[PDB]
Design a protein around this ligand. Structure first.
Ligand SMILES: [Fe+2]
Length: 214
């Protein structure tokens, strides 16, 4: 399965930094400033894309970024390449999970969260707890688990860690690398986690969910 089948390493040309659904010069209101978005996208994410292209050469041309990630996930000769490729995916996914002023949960996705976690609020509180206690740099995810009747599951990864390497299908990502929030929140990761809900694009999340269970 591919989460993002249109995220590729082109043949004969560099992988591009994906275009955001919103303009980063306006930040991503009401939660993020222009400068926080500018740094995260045009510095951090760009650097992952640039280094991915330099490490990949033409060896992975025509492959999806996800295919690369899987191909090199347990290859100690290519940890550097794994880190850039996985971070490229992680960031592309994360930036699609956010949009100015958010978008409401479609009823169908809301019902799947409610069934699994009891209520939306219970899901959010558990997700915030996982994010807060995700030690060091990393990502907190909501995934579908095909090996467990497609249950929704909260999963923490460290550094470039990417759920597809253990068979999980992400529907939501929140970056907890300190650079994701330090400009606008400084040390206050918990406030970042609580506030980000109001810019989550639940329509994108719902689509990821619908496709992950089909
Ligand atoms: Fe990041």
């Amino acid at each position: 399965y591919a989460t993002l089948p249109d995220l590729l390493k082109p043949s004969g040309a560099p992988a591009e930094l994906p275009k955001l659904g919103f303009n980063w010069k306006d930040g991503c209101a009401p939660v993020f400033s222009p400068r926080q978005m500018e740094l995260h996208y045009t510095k951090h994410h760009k650097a992952y894309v640039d280094k991915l292209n330099a490490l990949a050469g033409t060896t992975y041309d025509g492959k999806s970024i996800e295919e690369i990630i899987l191909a090199v996930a347990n290859d100690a000769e290519k940890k550097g390449l794994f880190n850039q490729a996985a971070q490229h995916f992680n960031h592309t996914f994360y930036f699609r999970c956010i949009t100015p002023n958010g978008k409401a949960m479609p009823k169908s996705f809301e019902s799947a969260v409610t069934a699994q976690f009891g209520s939306v609020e219970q899901f959010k509180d558990a997700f915030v707890q996982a994010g807060v206690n995700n030690f060091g740099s990393g990502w907190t995810w909501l995934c579908v688990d095909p090996s467990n009747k497609n249950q929704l599951v909260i999963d923490n990864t460290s550094n470039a860690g990417c759920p597809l390497t253990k068979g999980l299908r992400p529907v939501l990502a929140v970056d907890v690398w300190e650079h994701a929030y330090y400009k606008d929140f400084e040390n206050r990761r918990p406030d970042y986690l609580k506030e980000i809900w109001s810019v989550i694009d639940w329509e994108f999340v719902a689509k990821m969910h619908a496709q992950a269970i089909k």
